[model samples]
Target: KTFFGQPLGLSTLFMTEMWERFSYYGMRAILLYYMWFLISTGDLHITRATAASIMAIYASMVYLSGTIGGFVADRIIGARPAVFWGGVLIMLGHIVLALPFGASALFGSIILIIIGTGFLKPNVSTLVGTLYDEHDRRRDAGFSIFVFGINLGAFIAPLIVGAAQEAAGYHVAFSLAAIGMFIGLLVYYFGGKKTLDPHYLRPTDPLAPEEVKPLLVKVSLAVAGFIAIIVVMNLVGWNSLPAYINLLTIVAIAIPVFYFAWMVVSYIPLFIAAVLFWAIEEQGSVVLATFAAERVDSSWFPVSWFQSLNPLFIMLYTPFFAWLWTAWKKNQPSSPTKFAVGLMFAGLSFLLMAIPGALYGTSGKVSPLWLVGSWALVILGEMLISPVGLSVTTKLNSQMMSMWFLSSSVGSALNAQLVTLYNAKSEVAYFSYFGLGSVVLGIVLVFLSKRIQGL
Candidate 1:
């Protein structure tokens, strides 16, 4: 067996995923800046809160879709096909985004992108998992390498997409995103079979007679009903779509609770923790973006460029953390501790932002480095927590996995909408108070760390 018993395919997947992340992050790096430009130039009338909310909803939806994508890949399409479809969807979404658009068009494009992400994100990671056998020592190393690719993409994305948007236009910048998605699709298409298990990409397992018979009938009915409802809703108006979706979310959450109540409760605390993590983590894209928008100056440093700092630091620091963990194997902090620390760091990132907010009085400009520094600290905190949390989840029960993962998205959703809601209700001290409160919450989580460790 090889050193870690992992195939070199892991590296290929890693590079491919890194580029994919680069494409996605690059697109994201420019999105807020585009919104800001449109607002500044009178092309769009989005308030800071509105823009942040929109961003939150869109990003949340992408994460939220992972459950569906994961299910579909496991049951119907298989990982390779699902990933291919996802890449295609992402590419199409980006293409649509590059098209000229008014407000409705812009939203339409965002929806497409969100749907595309749903298909792509979960399956790619699943493919990585499939590359290793159960209990393989190389699994950790494989995932770690894969994560590095993800970060590399995120780090470069802002620099490329943000700069392109500034120099050329939003359309050109978005086109760059589309191109990246296409490239990823190409890589996966050519590589999947050769680099991965042919059977590994297949259905979760050959369906049992009872499972297959009922699922086929139910899924067919559900899909048909869904299409019919969507057709009716679309004919009526846009508002109907979200109303239906909200109803679906309500129903979906209940279904799981009804079926797996014991498992659900056992994991609820962890799920809550995930939600909290996402809530703080999402500030990067939402209120944090607003903080950057209102405070940063392109003349000094591109505001969007500050977004790159987190990933850049992640690239730099993750290896160090890995080394520390390896060298101090028995003494490394628990995942929950790392997670709590991450939250605290996130809180501190916000606190730093608050410093600038207080000094400039929210209306005046602040140094771009302050924003960059905040991201750096946030990344440090992220390094401490995120990697560990994923490991922790793997060690826990399976029922909790979906919920915990989904909660991350839910947390982002809450932040997206709540930050907007809170800011709209009150802006002057709103973010400052929120950040400060987060610090306290992090401390509380630290106190409760042992309880989490039991999970």
Candidate 2:
């Protein structure tokens, strides 16, 4: 079962990740609707803004939890155990969603999935890396094949799960997602037992005695203090306390301000460029998905199916882009230039989005081709900035790379606010304003491209 002369373990890893992605993307395809739809229809009946905020928070926490997941794998549970537990939790989360236990279950399921993804996502890739020596000729190809499995699963899940949701209802769709995870766990458990090296079954780096006690004490105090504060807040019932949305707003604003103050000055322009680019790129899930549901001619396909466009395009274009970069190595654009080009593409996508609302009006469904065209443009942007950013970070030996993760969090938080405006204003106005803003930012980056390259 060797693939490209790689070990059989690659196949196991591929299937495990493929099904994991299937369950994840499948759940996400309908999650927004589940939150925003009326309770009479077996949905949560929350406000659109609240739903967006919750989604942003959930996504941000998933990224943050990866740090914790990695720590636990290194210090306590081994990578293999962490991955197993993560899958179990993910399965349980989907099961909880399938039961229709209401808002509490929804939030509980979010927590489980966050914790599960933290453990499984990073660890599985780590396991894959362990399969080959550093110098193995097949290493990059193996990873690429595994990633293809991921994108393939992501591309297909929404079609299957979203159709189920549309036909059988939300709970049944979620049950199918649960079944996907269950299948993944079965494959991993059975196949991993034989394929994975024995060393992977234990912690790669267990904590020392001198470090463990202090770390445990700090963790205990933090947990206890957090609980105590929450209890006190509940007992006090301070009506003046700002809402969760307000708090997130403040933090989102503060993060960039703090980063600017602390980061090396030369990085600010590139950082700002990345942030703006991400803000538009991330809208695919929140704003664009909403637009599709409310305004697009999606009677032929589920709105969630549109979410697959980015990954689909990524898989389709990656090989071509890889060759283009290599073939044009001497004539390739500078990193900053590529970032500017990416922003231009992203801006153009939104500009394309504005057209339907302007010409046809947002009152009725427009052609799905508009959404398709928009995603194609934005994914082209992604192909430029996303991979280029990773390469630039490694080249510059930048320790501030963690800031890239925060870019999405900030972008998502901003989107939570923007969705409210989109609901209030004319859809044409919403799309046009952001579209123009992105274009202007792209232009600004282009102007500064020479200066940026020097850094």
Candidate 3:
């Protein structure tokens, strides 16, 4: 029942999901086998070792980049629009594979799919992060529910695509994936309709006016250098298999350590609006504070007092909600519902300025409560979920997901490196070695379980 209005609020969500997650996993399942055929049939001139490495590297980067890409989308691109842009890149990349293009098609297609999937990946969960409450156990349930959507795609994708490839050849196999992407676009455009709130269209960390130029200056130079280095490596024979495997192994290994920073930043998203209040209200002190000084009419009161108003309003509002939520019990809003309003309240607080500036204009100072009154909506947003703040935390699913993804990521990296050791002759020995290797580690975990709980 809750999942219904929840679904109504999320046309863009499930739709992009089916398209992006569905298409990617579906294609991915067959890709390892797909490359071997091309190399075997003399389509591309690469080694069997290369094929194994490619699969691991491709799979590894796809997951790894999602963490990085989602951060960029959350900070730079709007989460809503980032999802859209990812689909377009993904759709085109899938089409690139379907084309009659040759070895280079495979190369460029890999890059595009990497970019597309990475950008869209964690952002989906990031959106779901917004869809639930800070305290609701169901936030974990929300991700669980969405996993079914992705699994449905993964579960069935290979069967249909592999059948088509079984009946036909590799070309149409990829074409089907591209077709799914197109259908994904179709789902996204129409399914999203009026479902979006004002919040989804912008970044949580909107780019400041002065920051853009410096960022682009460095970004442009880096991009050109990275592309150049790859090409230079291509010509220099650095594109050989050993270099390829080792380079990515280094990167794939680096990512887990890179995310030790994950726990701190990870807490930021789970803490929700109270976390948001710091980010939002800090601006209230800066941008809005400046707005207060420049735009707010100061009679006897100084504009610096605008900062105190939020605290004053919150103290006043807290007792009412503290009692209200307890008395209301199950009759009150859902966690997702409260947070949604909280975000909306914070947004309208920002949007409230549009009216005053549009009508009265910004030249002279206006009513002090103009700034004071905005805090009403701000605190209303805060208190709706603020009392929930006594609760918490990603224990949210992100940490668990990150932990699990690290395991999967580490496994894939091993698969990538281990495949080169693989052969018909030694296959049995390989399994025995890795099996004993991991089994002993499981015992180590048994030893740590007493203290592992606090970590």
Put down candidate 2 lDDT per residue, 37-156, tens digits, no spaces.
644355555567667667666666676566467668877899999889999999999999999576668878998998999999878988999899889988878888888899988888
TM-score of each predicted structure versus truth: 0.85, 0.91, 0.64
- Give the alpha carbon lDDT tens digit for every residue of 1-455 in model 1: 33244686776567667766877787777777677767787877767556766676667677777778877778777777777777787777778768886454566667776777777788788888877778888788887777878988888888888788778888998999889877777777776656777875677755667787798899899889877866776777744433544544444445445535664343454555566667777778666666666656657556677678778888898889888878986767888777777777877877776676566665566677887787787778777767666667777655556666666667766665567654422544665666677677778778887887776
Q: Model 3: residues >4 Å from true position, as ranges?
A: 1-5, 10-12, 133-138, 213-237, 258-407
For each candidate in the order shown, give its overall lDDT on alpha carbons: 0.71, 0.80, 0.61
- Can you give the lDDT of residue 202 in candidate 1? 72
Tell me which of candidates 1 and 3 scores higher on TM-score: 1
- Model 3 agreement with the true structure over 1-455: per-residue lDDT tens digits: 45544545454566567667657755665565567667877987887666766766676677666766766786798877777788788887878878887667877888888888777777766776776667866564465456545545554555566566666776797888888878877776676655555586689897789988998998899678767867887998898866776767766666554555553443323233333333343344334544654566665543344555665576567557757877996756554345445655655665565556656644655777666777787778777654443333333355444533443355455556766664434433443444343334334433433343233
Once model 1 is optimally superposed onto the true structure by TM-score, how far is the C-alpha of residue 441 displaced, in angstroms? 2.0
Query: Which structure among the candidates has the greatest TM-score?
Result: 2
Identify the superior model by lDDT, candidate 1 or candidate 2.
2
Give me candidate 3's TM-score against the actual structure.
0.64
- Candidate 1, residue 434: the lDDT equals 63
